[PDB]
Input
Amino acid sequence: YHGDSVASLGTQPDLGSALYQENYKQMKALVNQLHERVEHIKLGGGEKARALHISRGKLLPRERIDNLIDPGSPFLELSQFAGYQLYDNEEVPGGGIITGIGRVSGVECMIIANDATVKGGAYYPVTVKKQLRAQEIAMQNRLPCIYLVDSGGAYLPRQADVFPDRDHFGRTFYNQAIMSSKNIAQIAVVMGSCTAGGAYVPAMADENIIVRKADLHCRKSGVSDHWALDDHHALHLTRKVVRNLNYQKKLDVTIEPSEEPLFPADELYGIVGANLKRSFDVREVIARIVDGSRFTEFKAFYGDTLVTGFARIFGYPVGIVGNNGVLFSESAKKGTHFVQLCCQRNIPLLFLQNITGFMVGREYEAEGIAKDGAKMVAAVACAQVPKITLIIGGSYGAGNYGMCGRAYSPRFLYIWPNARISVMGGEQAANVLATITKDQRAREGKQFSSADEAALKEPIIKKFEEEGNPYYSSARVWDDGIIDPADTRLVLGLSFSAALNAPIEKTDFGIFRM
Amino acid sequence: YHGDSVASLGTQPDLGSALYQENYKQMKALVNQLHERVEHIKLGGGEKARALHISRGKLLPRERIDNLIDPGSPFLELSQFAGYQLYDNEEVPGGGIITGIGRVSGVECMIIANDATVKGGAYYPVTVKKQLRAQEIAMQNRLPCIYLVDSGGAYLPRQADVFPDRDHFGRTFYNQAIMSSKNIAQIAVVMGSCTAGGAYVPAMADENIIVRKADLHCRKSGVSDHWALDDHHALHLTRKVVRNLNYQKKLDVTIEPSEEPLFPADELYGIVGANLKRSFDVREVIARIVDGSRFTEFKAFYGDTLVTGFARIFGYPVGIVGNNGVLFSESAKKGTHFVQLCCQRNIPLLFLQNITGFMVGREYEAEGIAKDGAKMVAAVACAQVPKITLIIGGSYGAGNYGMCGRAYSPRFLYIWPNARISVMGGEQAANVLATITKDQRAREGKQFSSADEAALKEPIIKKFEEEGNPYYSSARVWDDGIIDPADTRLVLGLSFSAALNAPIEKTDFGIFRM
Amino acid sequence: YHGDSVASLGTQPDLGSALYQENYKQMKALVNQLHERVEHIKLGGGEKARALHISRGKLLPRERIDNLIDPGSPFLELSQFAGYQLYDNEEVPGGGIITGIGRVSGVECMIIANDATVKGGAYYPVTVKKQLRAQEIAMQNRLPCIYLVDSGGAYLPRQADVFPDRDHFGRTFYNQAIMSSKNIAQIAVVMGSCTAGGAYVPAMADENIIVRKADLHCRKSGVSDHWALDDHHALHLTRKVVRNLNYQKKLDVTIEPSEEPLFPADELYGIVGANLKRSFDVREVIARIVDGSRFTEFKAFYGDTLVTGFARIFGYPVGIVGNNGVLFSESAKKGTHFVQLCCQRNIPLLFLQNITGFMVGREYEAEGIAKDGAKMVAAVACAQVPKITLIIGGSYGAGNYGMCGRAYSPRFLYIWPNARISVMGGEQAANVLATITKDQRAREGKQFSSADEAALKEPIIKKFEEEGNPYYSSARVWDDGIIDPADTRLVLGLSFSAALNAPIEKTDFGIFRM
Amino acid sequence: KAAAKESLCQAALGLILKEKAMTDTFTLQAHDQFSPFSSSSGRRLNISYTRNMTLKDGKNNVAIAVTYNHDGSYSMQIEDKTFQVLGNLYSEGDCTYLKCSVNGVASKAKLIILENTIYLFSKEGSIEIDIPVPKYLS
Ligand SMILES: CC(C)=CC(=O)SCCNC(=O)CCNC(=O)[C@H](O)C(C)(C)COP(=O)(O)OP(=O)(O)OC[C@@H]1O[C@H](n2cnc3c(N)ncnc32)[C@@H](O)[C@@H]1OP(=O)(O)O
Ligand SMILES: CC(C)=CC(=O)SCCNC(=O)CCNC(=O)[C@H](O)C(C)(C)COP(=O)(O)OP(=O)(O)OC[C@@H]1O[C@H](n2cnc3c(N)ncnc32)[C@@H](O)[C@@H]1OP(=O)(O)O
Ligand SMILES: CC(C)=CC(=O)SCCNC(=O)CCNC(=O)[C@H](O)C(C)(C)COP(=O)(O)OP(=O)(O)OC[C@@H]1O[C@H](n2cnc3c(N)ncnc32)[C@@H](O)[C@@H]1OP(=O)(O)O
Output
């Protein structure tokens, strides 16, 4: 029986409120800026290289993606902002590579396409990082990989950062071999010149498609498994190969009919705004994203600063954990309990981080908070269910670790355009450094002047402010993308769908330090 | 029956030869320089901080290691050169942390000790990398971890490189939790101040030892499992805890009595020298290191450029693969065959890299060499037996990948003081860039002057020369240490011994592209 | 998405061509002869024994099969030609036993029925071989076995070939026991006299049905589990028992709607003909049999002599491997690659053999061809996916091994009425023997005359010609039947359907000698 | 007479809707009935997705740029003109009928696609638009 009613979250916000108006203005401005920057990145390497690429008869990489995926299928691009102002004078749109998840012949696949326009498709260090992240995603979620190889090899002026180390270029080939061993299909499509150091990708792959115009490779080397007249033919052949994969999706979770949330998503703009100093109820966000705005809270009156519960997204079950204030002992214990419960029942986990800075409270007895957050950290680390993190606000200190940051391998991690990430708030770091130097130079009997205090403080403030920018964090691959809040639900759906390809296996826990 | 005789490798070198004299002089100079630099690093943070540390009553970290390990046991330190001239003006001896493998209570354990003298034990990015490498080694080889925590938290002026990303600070805790889940003992000894962000390490650990002089932690928090009067008492308690671990070493390989090599190891100095342009027979090295100088070559007359065979080191079986010239198709096929054979019989693998540069030969038809080296790369990547790499000469290009570089996760990787590592030789890269620019500006009709040719070439030459230095590569953690050749055998023994702690499991291979 | 179009094989043959007319005439004559011989075998032991059998009130074995299987279900009979002119003066139609696969109560089952008319149902050696082959098929494909026991025991005048050895009579009981242990149902129906040495079959079976008219067996011995009034009642009881088996078919491969081939099958008669000297494109056959004539070739321009690709038969996926000329190194490597690929994706394999004799080329450097065909042989042997072989032309030498001959345990093996199988061509063997004797008697100084050359040559030619006949090979159980080409598709469908009953398990490969 | 721009827009919409229908069938077979990937939305992150389609009218080739709006309507630009089209395909009797509004003008037709040709049957008449063969499928 599934007929009894359930209470729904969410309340209608006050559209007339001045606070709502101001928050809406600020967040809409941020989203417009994000959209403009994304368009500029989408334009690619430049009109020069684009005209040259077209004159050679080859398709532009975005056109390749469009023709490859199923007609009208949504495409989930990752890390559109890699390399954004990362290098001092060189502009590297999209990191020189395009990675995403899309449905080909009814199968979710991870597509990795080199962009020939950007520096002839050379490999900047950020490009290697992006590709490794994509391969890691595909390995974890058991997704076939399709490479659209139009490469130029390592960027020589930066070889020291691309070639030698463990997470450097060679790891790419390593991943390929491993994913072939675990029976995850590898398809390579040599749509560009087969330059030095590039033939390794087709040779490692399970199956190859090579566009006609090395010649020795198809006729004598035999590296070629298929031989295509041009780009369109190659993409069609790729679709045929994917069909011939003999794969069927196995899902192991209960499914229910999906239902839209009761409240419009754009209202989030008013609720969240751009000021981190003001706070908001995470329950509003949860009401905006989950199915039917139906939510079953767990331990509501204990550890109120954390909001844990169960819901459904597009019919899949999810356990939601979010911050609603300063984390405490009770909140940590509640989180550990909830994580154990979700792991036992094999339910995917969704974290929402809105870590609150310690500027409000001087001490907060970091020892006890640490003693309890350690338990939550261990529980999150040992979990095996799919985990997806979303940073809707500040993310500072060990709380970031506790709420499944990058170090804890969430299947995906996205940030809203108003997030901030750093070890601490800038002013707190300034005070810490000032106190350290003051105490030390007092210990040696040296005098500490207030001018020196300002001299230490100001650079730290500016540096922390600059490094906390979402664009700074997404230029490096610290997140899989910056998403417009109004689309959040949709993205999560796609992500969770992909995460369901892999089977869910049992969770083993370490010693629970009681 | 084990009585029939076996032929032994190695020949007596010509001590009177001028070439031998010169090579000996150069290599001995390199080793002396290495020893001097190691002594200076061993001195630690400085006399100032050392006196301050002693005045507080605490032991110096090296003394801690000496008292912790079994009396007279050899200690295998890793990455003594991390941070060597890595940061512009800050001197960070040993990376601010000391990691090694040593025998405690008859059990091989991985010991990680913070150095309080260096910047109060703060965590530079290189320190995080070193610690993560140590934890990875312990996880792979199934070794108990002992932490001697005297920490100061992240180095704030560099927070952007320490806190946020996947391989940044949080991964430490992640590793701890995981290694606790797989039943690998975690012991933490809080020998310093329990500052903010430090209590997480004791809280994550399985067992704790805390030196008396937080107080709340032992009496009320209950984080303390043991409570020690001072450093000596804490180390004794640690030995007792390790004994109480209830662990017994399980070995799954045949063992034979060990026998010393027939030739003195110091002769290597004469054989190898410091000039990479000259070449030498790897069989000399193999004769110098393996037991009794007994070696059973495999496919000796096919692919002569690669030397593959079987031997014993301290009684353990090893399969040895080394370069003796430019790698070719036949060499790659021989290597793939040998790797498959060793994986089938569960024998550890030892690689010796002496990759030869392509300055000698203009083309070397990179397509066929690539088509075959891809097979060797796949075979090496998919292997599951313990793999140890040693770089005795040049290491360039995809050959580095083929001979199990860092990207392919060897259990250990060491380099001799005369190695060079880079994507290509400097002059080759200069020629490549010059040709690219010349061809392009010819395409646009622009004129290319010889002055511009020199202007491009010289910086590239100097940069590649600088980046290839062993000290440059070991400052970053690209290798687990620079070893005196005269000690090589010994080191390998210890390493292989440690690698035998983990059980050897079956190897799964991808599609062998025939 | 499954909407994009695929190119189809096959071309309309030239019906007006004289070559087509002649080939059609010859092949139609062969098929008519085959049909006539099959009818004569179907007539059974003879009118004498048939009248005697009817007078006893028992049904004829073919009537038993007709009533047993589901109404209108197709029945796949195996080895209709066993014993055809095998013994000098004794005519043994069908080997004295009838084995086939048919659907009973919606379950594929292997039916084995003794023919009482032929020598009172005695067991000739060929009968034992046929029964063992049927039991092997059922074991491999996990099919319930139904025995219709009307036996007479071993044929005493030939006891030395029936009783003692491993593949002699006792192995029957062995198989029964084993197939009972692995939970494969054994049903025995004693429709004839329970003579000496026959009661073992009911006693070994899981369930029994005994026709009333030993009496002691049902009332006191208790061997009887069911007791039937006559043959019709016994068959009905058998259907009820099969229903009570509690079995459900588990399929683990993707299924698509089936579609008929685009070209008529009878055209094969014109394409293939009866002359092995002329050649034809195997792609014509593939177009005639696969679904929709859709085929996705793999490595089309490399090793053109072998044709490998993917297709669907009645909606199931199949990998097709066929000969189109003399096998070479590249062909062998392509075959090994394709076999690995199909094993990885768990796809059934279908081999078509048209091995070409070496009369065209004197040497063909057998050493290299052997060195490469060894790889293909190993790959085929180690494979675990269902394998079905079809011999559409010549089959000679090690090529037969390479294309999955009987020694390599294909689930089924059929031959067309125009095949030839032998170690070599007759003339080649004659030349080899002549050269051996000539060289030897030259070595001893004896003279070799041309009359002696003819004397050696002619008997060998005649003997090889006689032994290569399809009827000769099918008289012994070297194949599971001779099939009219026009029906080939249908047969394959049924066969593959049966092969899907067993689960497909992973393939383990030996050392790939690179 | 040469077919107008509007008929080409209607034909393009019909072909897209057919692709959506095949996607629906494949979704019906699969386990993951409610996966967002099965939608024919063409949604991209922070970008609007545009198809360059080629349709063959008479002896002249015409290129249509179809932008997938978030609302589900399609913005098709042929040459200079841009057209806003919203439509759906529904079965009248035994027959597929396309109802489509182009620039706010609603039209009803019978849509039959066999091989390359697309047949719009309406009161005004019948319009045949040919999908060019990839010419690698011969
Ligand atoms: C695996 C292992 C173990 C090792 C290796 O792989 S070692 C690989 C060595 N690489 C090559 O051997 C390829 C050398 N390229 C070429 O042969 C071509 O260039 C192509 C093939 C790239 C096509 O490119 P193209 O010829 O069609 O156009 P182009 O404009 O010339 O393309 C942009 C121009 O590339 C210049 N450029 C600068 N740095 C690099 C770089 N590292 N790689 C490529 N190009 C680079 C850029 O500065 C200029 O543009 P810019 O900056 O002047 O605007
Ligand atoms: C986990 C998460 C999620 C988050 C975190 O963990 S956020 C952690 C914040 N850290 C602290 O809150 C510890 C603040 N230290 C102190 O409270 C003390 O200092 C001790 C405890 C370190 C003992 O040291 P001590 O007091 O015995 O000696 P001191 O000489 O003072 O030691 C050297 C001096 O440390 C200065 N120094 C510069 N940068 C740092 C730094 N990042 N950390 C520590 N010290 C630093 C150095 O510049 C000077 O020496 P120098 O450069 O002048 O020669
Ligand atoms: C497992 C182990 C470890 C050991 C054993 O199993 S040791 C088994 C010993 N066998 C018996 O103990 C059965 C003895 N048969 C009989 O008791 C019956 O015969 C029946 C039961 C067969 C029914 O047959 P039936 O009685 O209805 O008709 P019949 O014409 O008589 O049938 C044909 C006639 O059988 C003659 N014939 C010749 N050789 C044999 C033979 N080897 N077995 C049977 N019959 C044979 C044939 O020559 C003549 O015909 P032909 O050649 O004259 O035309």
